[PDB]
Coordinates of C-alpha atoms and ligand atoms in Angstrom, one line a residue:
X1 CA 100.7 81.3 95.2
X2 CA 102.1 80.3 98.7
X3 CA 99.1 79.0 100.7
X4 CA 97.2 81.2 103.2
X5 CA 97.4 80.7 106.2
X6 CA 101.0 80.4 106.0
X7 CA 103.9 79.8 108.6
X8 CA 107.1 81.2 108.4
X9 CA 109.3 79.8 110.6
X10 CA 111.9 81.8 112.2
X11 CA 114.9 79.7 112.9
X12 CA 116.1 80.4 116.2
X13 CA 114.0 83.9 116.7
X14 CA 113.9 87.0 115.7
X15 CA 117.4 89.5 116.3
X16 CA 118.1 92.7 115.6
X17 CA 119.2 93.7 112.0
X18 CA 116.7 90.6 110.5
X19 CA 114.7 91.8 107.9
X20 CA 111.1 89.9 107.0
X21 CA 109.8 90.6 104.0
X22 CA 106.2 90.2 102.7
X23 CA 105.2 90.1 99.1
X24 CA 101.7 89.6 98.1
X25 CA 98.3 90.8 96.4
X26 CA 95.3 92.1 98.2
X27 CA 92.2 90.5 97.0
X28 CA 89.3 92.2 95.9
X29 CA 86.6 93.3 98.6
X30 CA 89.2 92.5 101.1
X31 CA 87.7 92.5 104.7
X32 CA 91.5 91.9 106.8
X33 CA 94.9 90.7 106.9
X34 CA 97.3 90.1 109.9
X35 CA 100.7 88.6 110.2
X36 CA 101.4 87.3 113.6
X37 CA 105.2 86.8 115.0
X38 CA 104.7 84.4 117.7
X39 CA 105.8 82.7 121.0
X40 CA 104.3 79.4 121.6
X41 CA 100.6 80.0 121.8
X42 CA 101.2 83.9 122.8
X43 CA 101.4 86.7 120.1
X44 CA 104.3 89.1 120.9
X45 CA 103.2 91.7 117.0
X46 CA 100.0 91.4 115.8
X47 CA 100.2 93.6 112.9
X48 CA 96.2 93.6 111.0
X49 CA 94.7 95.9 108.6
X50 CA 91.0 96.3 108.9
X51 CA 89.5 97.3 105.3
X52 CA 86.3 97.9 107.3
X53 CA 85.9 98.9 110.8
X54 CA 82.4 100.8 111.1
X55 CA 83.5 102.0 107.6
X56 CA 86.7 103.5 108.1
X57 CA 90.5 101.3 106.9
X58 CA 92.5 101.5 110.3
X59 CA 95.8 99.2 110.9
X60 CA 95.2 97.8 114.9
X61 CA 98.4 96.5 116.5
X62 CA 98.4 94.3 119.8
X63 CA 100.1 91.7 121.5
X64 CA 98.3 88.4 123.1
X65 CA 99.5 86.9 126.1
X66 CA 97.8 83.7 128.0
X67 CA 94.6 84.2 125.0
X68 CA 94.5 87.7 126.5
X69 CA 94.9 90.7 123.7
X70 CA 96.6 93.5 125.5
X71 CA 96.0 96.9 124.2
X72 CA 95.8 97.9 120.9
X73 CA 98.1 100.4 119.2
X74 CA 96.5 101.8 115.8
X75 CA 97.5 103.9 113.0
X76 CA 94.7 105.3 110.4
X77 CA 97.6 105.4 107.7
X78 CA 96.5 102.5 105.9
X79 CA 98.6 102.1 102.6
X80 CA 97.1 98.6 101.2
X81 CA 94.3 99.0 98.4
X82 CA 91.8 96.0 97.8
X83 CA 93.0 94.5 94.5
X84 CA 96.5 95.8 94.4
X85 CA 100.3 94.4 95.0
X86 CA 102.4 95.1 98.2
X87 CA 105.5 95.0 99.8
X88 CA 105.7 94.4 104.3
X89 CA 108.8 95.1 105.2
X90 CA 109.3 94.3 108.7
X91 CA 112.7 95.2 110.4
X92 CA 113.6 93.9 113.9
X93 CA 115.0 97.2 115.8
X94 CA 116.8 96.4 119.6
X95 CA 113.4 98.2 121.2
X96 CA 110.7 97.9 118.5
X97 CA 109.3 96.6 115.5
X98 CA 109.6 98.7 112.0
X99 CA 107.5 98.1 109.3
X100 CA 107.2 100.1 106.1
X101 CA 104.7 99.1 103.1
X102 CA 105.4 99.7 99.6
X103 CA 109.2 101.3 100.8
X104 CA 107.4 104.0 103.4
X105 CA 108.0 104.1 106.4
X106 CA 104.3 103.1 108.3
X107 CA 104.6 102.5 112.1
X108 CA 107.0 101.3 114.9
X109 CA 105.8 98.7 117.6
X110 CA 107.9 98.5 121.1
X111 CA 108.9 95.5 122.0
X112 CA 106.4 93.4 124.8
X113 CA 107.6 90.2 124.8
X114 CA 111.2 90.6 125.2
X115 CA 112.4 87.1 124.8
X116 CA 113.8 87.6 120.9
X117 CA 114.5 84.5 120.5
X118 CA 111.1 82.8 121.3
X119 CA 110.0 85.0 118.8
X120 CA 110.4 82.0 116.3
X121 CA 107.5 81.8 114.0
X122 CA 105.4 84.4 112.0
X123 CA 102.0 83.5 110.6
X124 CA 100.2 85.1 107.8
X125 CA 96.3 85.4 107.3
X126 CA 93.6 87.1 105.8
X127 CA 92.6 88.3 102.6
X128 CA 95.4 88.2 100.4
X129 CA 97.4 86.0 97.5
X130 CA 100.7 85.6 99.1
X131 CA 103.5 86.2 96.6
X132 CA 106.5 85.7 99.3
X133 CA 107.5 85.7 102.7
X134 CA 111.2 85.5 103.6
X135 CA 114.0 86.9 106.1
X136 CA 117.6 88.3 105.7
X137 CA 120.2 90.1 108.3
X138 CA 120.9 93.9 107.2
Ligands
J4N201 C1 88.0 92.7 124.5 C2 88.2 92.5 123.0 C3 87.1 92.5 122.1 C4 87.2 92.3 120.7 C5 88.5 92.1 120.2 S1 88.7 91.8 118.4 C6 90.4 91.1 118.2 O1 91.3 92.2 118.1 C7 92.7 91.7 118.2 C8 93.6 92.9 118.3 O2 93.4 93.6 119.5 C9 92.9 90.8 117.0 O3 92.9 91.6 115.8 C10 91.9 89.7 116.9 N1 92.1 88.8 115.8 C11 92.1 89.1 114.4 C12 92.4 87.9 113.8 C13 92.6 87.6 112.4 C14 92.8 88.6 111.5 C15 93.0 88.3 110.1 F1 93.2 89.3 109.3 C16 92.9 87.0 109.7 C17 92.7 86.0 110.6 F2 92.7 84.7 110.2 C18 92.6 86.3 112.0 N2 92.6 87.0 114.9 N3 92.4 87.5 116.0 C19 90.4 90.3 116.9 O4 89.6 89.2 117.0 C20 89.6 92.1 121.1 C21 89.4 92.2 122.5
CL202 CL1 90.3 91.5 112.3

């Protein structure tokens, strides 16, 4: 419904206690998907499920600084499913990203870039009809 790829600003960055939340439907024979909170031209959370790395589903997590990706952080609990509806909620924490899919808990990412508040845009890509994409403080 909501055009992919999307922006979502953040208005004034990101802060502990803010909520983003993610609705949207995989499509079928989906190859990846990544949601990218971003400073200027850097990526401080690159969160991206790979339906097919050298046939296995793994979530990779990294950060890009200057153009350069950092090291990736990866979790082979991958909950989407080609074809099906989801839920990303992604919590801002005072040292880390949380993000649970479909209400469970998934993974935690620390915090590189440390300047919250230049946090102040999140893109979304990949292979998926986009239902949603919207913030609120807890
Ligand atoms: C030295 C080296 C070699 C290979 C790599 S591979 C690289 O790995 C990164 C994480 O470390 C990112 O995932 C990166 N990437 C994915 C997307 C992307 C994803 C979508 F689902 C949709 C879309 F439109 C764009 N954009 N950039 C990937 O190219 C990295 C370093
Ligand atoms: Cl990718």
């Amino acid at each position: 419904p909501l055009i992919v790829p999307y922006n979502l600003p953040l208005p004034g960055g990101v802060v502990p206690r803010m909520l983003i939340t993610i609705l949207g439907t995989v499509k079928p024979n989906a190859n990846r998907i990544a949601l990218d909170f971003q400073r200027g031209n850097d990526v401080a959370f690159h969160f991206n499920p790979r339906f097919n790395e050298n046939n296995r589903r793994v979530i990779v997590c990294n950060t890009k600084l200057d153009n350069n990706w950092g090291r990736e952080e990866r979790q082979s609990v991958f909950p989407f499913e080609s074809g099906k509806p989801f839920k990303i909620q992604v919590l801002v924490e005072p040292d880390h990203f949380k993000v649970a899919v479909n209400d469970a808990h998934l993974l935690q990412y620390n915090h590189r870039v440390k300047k919250l508040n230049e946090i102040s845009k999140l893109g979304i890509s990949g292979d998926i009809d986009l239902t949603s994409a919207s913030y609120t403080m807890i």
